[PDB]
Amino acid sequence: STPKIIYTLTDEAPALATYSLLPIIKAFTGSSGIAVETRDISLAGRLIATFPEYLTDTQKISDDLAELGKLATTPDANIIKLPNISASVPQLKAAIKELQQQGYKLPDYPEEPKTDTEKDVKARYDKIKGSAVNPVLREGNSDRRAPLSVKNYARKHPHKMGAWSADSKSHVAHMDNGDFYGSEKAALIGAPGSVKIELIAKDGSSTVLKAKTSVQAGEIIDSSVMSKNALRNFIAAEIEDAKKQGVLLSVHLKATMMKVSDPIMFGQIVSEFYKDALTKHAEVLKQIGFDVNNGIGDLYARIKTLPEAKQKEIEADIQAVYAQRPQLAMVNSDKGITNLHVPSDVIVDASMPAMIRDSGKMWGPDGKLHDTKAVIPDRCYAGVYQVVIEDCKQHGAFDPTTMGSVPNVGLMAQKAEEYGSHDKTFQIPADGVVRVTDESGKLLLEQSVEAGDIWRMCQAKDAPIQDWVKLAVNRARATNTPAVFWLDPARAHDAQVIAKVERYLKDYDTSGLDIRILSPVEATRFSLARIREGKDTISVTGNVLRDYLTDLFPIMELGTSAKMLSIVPLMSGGGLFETGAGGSAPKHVQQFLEEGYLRWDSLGEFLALAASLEHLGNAYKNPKALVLASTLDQATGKILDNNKSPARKVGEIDNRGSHFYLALYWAQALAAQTEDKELQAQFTGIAKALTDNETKIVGELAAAQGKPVDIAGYYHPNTDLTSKAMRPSATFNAALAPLA
């Protein structure tokens, strides 16, 4: 019956931080009638939950991801979601190995299943790897923006911005035709039903690609195709031009999430770039099972089984290739790891803003920065980035001390658009035409295709879209800031969305508001003009642009996309608060294990918690929760103003130290506020204890630094050892003891 806040237990860095912060949260929220429950969505937990039949009664655990998904569609849900692993196969195997060493008899991951058991096992493991969590929890749209506190702090403490030259040779390179953008076709579903996706080959034959896909009334579905011939010709031409202009060739895709389309596109780029070597050694590469879609790094891993004489020859022919091609942007120049080694190394949402901020440059083989030709094949979003680059060439770097802000209202509920296209993406087996028909046999979408092409279909439902418009009007009204819908009338999909947006906007009183619809490129130019004059503009966009813009603007404005709000007003009425948009920082864990220092910044957790408390306070009419939220806002502001966030080496406060300061400031705020006497009385002694013991506590926390830390594991560490290491201050622990 007590109102609950679900706190996700995740992986690596945030997981460690949670052992320190969660106890604090529980202690501060207890007296206000709030309960905090955890749900395990860690890679290891999701693996264990999936194979109960291979486990002892005591090893089994509840399937918390499924539980959360159900919760996300309930009216009173209140979830705080921290960053987590979207596992690569290597991470998956590593986690499986660790668990087996711990006694969990999980089956091995079979990369090439040849038995009923292996096939069943691989299918299940495949649903666990990759971006498995977000699609389940995101049952609402996105309200992502940096808090005013963070913006104001950035304004006063400007981060470094690479200077821009009007002579910069950097730019985005995209196809002119033959891409998804140029072939998009859409249809508006009239009534409930389902569609069939079939390939009608030239040889007359027919192949069902996906027999059934349920569709709702008012749902928008669209098909598009990336032409293999056009992509290859585009790549070949850009390779030559990069070499001619003397710039680094870089590639910006979203391989981990766009698990079907992007690795294929990545592979086609790798194939054309290294064609002389790959063709020459075609037979032996097939023999060792080389998978070009997994990058050239896959070749280096698999050739280690061939005679040393062969490895030598192959590696030499690869070097001959590099001498004939333009230089590649590097992920790690010292180790010779290029942009083409691993598909998941360079991720477009973070890589493009990083490049734009750093003078439009990337690392070259020499370990220095150089201008670059950023390849983003498809035209749908490539233009947005080009506009930013041109803006910087003409106006110079952005000025964090005066620039405005561009928050985002994004459409993502129910795996909207590209995010739910994976099971409807197919590499075409043979020339023909793909047809999408409904149950009555009506032809909804028809696309001519060639063998090797990438065909895909996306879906966008009406309820998500109406809620998305509602959210946009809400934000515009709350901030009295102009809002712009980024929709391209030339795209069949966007055109269908525009029709809905124009209709739904009429469902609101927008009299004193400034709302408009512009194509992505026009929207970008409009927003950048306003941002440089210090004005704000709300970007209202689809799922992918939500992803891109919420990394892009925070990077320019704040120098980081790790300090902000990612509020998800669940369509069922609940609230989901994501603490961070990034990864779980494996490197932070490495430093912690090596020298007992955790540099993870929990600011996002503090921000999300305040939003969660406010949500609970309003939903349950709990006055104390609202006071807890207000005082936490103050404490978080002091963390920023008094510079109590983690440092980087050893000696200074780390993640644990920042949590102490949060507790200190929060308790002090609670003891001084005049809205709730019971909380004031209760936290007076707590504030005194933390205040009087600041030096002693900070010292005990610092004493836990400087030595190796062993928590008996990585993906599934011993909880007692981890808890001990993350809560080393007996004085701090004792100070919160009275809390109930």
Annotated binding-site residues for NADP(+) read: 84, 86, 134, 584, 588, 599, 601, 648
Query: From residue 555 to residue 594, what is the string marking binding to Mn ion with x (rule CB under 5 A)?
Result: --------------------------x-------------
Q: Which of residues 385-404 bind Mn ion (CB under 5 A)?
A: none
405 close to 536: Cβ distance less than 8 angstroms: yes
> CB under 5 A: which stretch of 202-210, 390-398, 455-463, 547-555 binds Mn ion?
547-555
The DSSP output letter for 140 is: B
Q: Classify each residue of 193-203 as buried b or exposed e, where b means 16 or more C-beta atoms within 10 Å of its C-beta.
A: bebbbbbebee
Closer residue to Mn ion in complex, CB, 87/221: 87
Any contact of residue 40 with Mn ion (CB under 5 A)?
no
- Closest contact distance (angstroms) between CB of 72 and Mn ion is 20
Closer residue to Mn ion in complex, CB, 482/582: 582
User: C-alpha 391: how far from its chain's center?
Assistant: 26
Residue 487 structure tokens: 């929709």
Beta strands 171-173; 369-375: pairing state: parallel
Closer residue to Mn ion in complex, CB, 182/580: 580
The 3 state secondary structure assigned to 459-492 is EECHHHHHHHHHHHHHHHHHHCCCEEEECCCCCH
CA distance 397 to 392: 5
User: C-alpha 683: how far from its chain's center?
Assistant: 38
Q: What is the DSSP string of 600-628?
A: ---HHHHHHHHHHHHHHHHHTT-HHHHHH
- Closest contact distance (angstroms) between CB of 547 and Mn ion is 4
CA distance 9 to 6: 10
Closer residue to Mn ion in complex, CB, 95/545: 545
Q: What is the CA radius of gyration of the chain?
A: 27
> CB under 5 A: which stretch of 541-549, 636-644, 676-684, 699-707 binds Mn ion?
541-549
Residues that bind Mn ion (rule: CB under 5 A) add up to a total of 3
487 close to 517: Cβ distance less than 8 angstroms: yes
Q: Contact with Mn ion (CB under 5 A): which of 349, 378, 578, 633? A: 349
CA distance 477 to 509: 10
- Closest contact distance (angstroms) between CB of 256 and Mn ion is 11
- Closest contact distance (angstroms) between CB of 477 and Mn ion is 27
Sequence-distant (6+) residues with CB within 8 A of 541 are 408, 409, 410, 411, 485, 486, 549
Sheet with 206-215, edge to edge strand ranges: 206-215, 193-201, 432-438, 443-449
Q: Contact with Mn ion (CB under 5 A): which of 345, 547, 557, 700? A: 547
The annotation places the binding site at 84, 86, 131, 134, 138, 144, 254, 349, 419, 546-547, 584, 588, 599, 601, 648
- Closest contact distance (angstroms) between CB of 548 and Mn ion is 8
> CB under 5 A: which stretch of 237-245, 280-288, 346-354, 593-601 binds Mn ion?
346-354
Closer residue to Mn ion in complex, CB, 580/637: 580
CA distance 207 to 384: 37
Residue 122: φ, ψ to 5°: -60, -40
- Closest contact distance (angstroms) between CB of 257 and Mn ion is 9
CA distance 582 to 562: 7
- Closest contact distance (angstroms) between CB of 159 and Mn ion is 19
Which residue's C-beta sits nearest to Mn ion? 349
Within 13 Å of residue 677, how many CA atoms lie on the same side as its CB? 0
- Closest contact distance (angstroms) between CB of 165 and Mn ion is 28
Closer residue to Mn ion in complex, CB, 547/700: 547
- Closest contact distance (angstroms) between CB of 495 and Mn ion is 26
The annotation places the binding site for Mn(2+) at 349, 547
- Closest contact distance (angstroms) between CB of 546 and Mn ion is 8
The annotation places the binding site for D-threo-isocitrate at 131, 134, 138, 144, 254, 419, 546
Closer residue to Mn ion in complex, CB, 445/565: 565
82 close to 10: Cβ distance less than 8 angstroms: yes
> CB under 5 A: which stretch of 138-146, 154-162, 539-547, 676-684 binds Mn ion?
539-547
Residue 119 structure tokens: 């096939």
Closer residue to Mn ion in complex, CB, 239/581: 581
* Alpha helix stretches (DSSP H) within 406-538: 462-479, 492-504, 520-532
- Closest contact distance (angstroms) between CB of 551 and Mn ion is 5
Closer residue to Mn ion in complex, CB, 581/662: 581
Sequence-distant (6+) residues with CB within 8 A of 428 are 199, 225, 434, 449, 450, 451, 452, 453, 454, 455
β-bridge mates for residue 620, sequence order: none
Nearest by Cα to 170 from 374, 353, 376: 374
Closer residue to Mn ion in complex, CB, 86/658: 86
Closer residue to Mn ion in complex, CB, 347/445: 347
Instruction: Using CB under 5 A, list all residues that contact Mn ion.
Output: 349, 547, 581
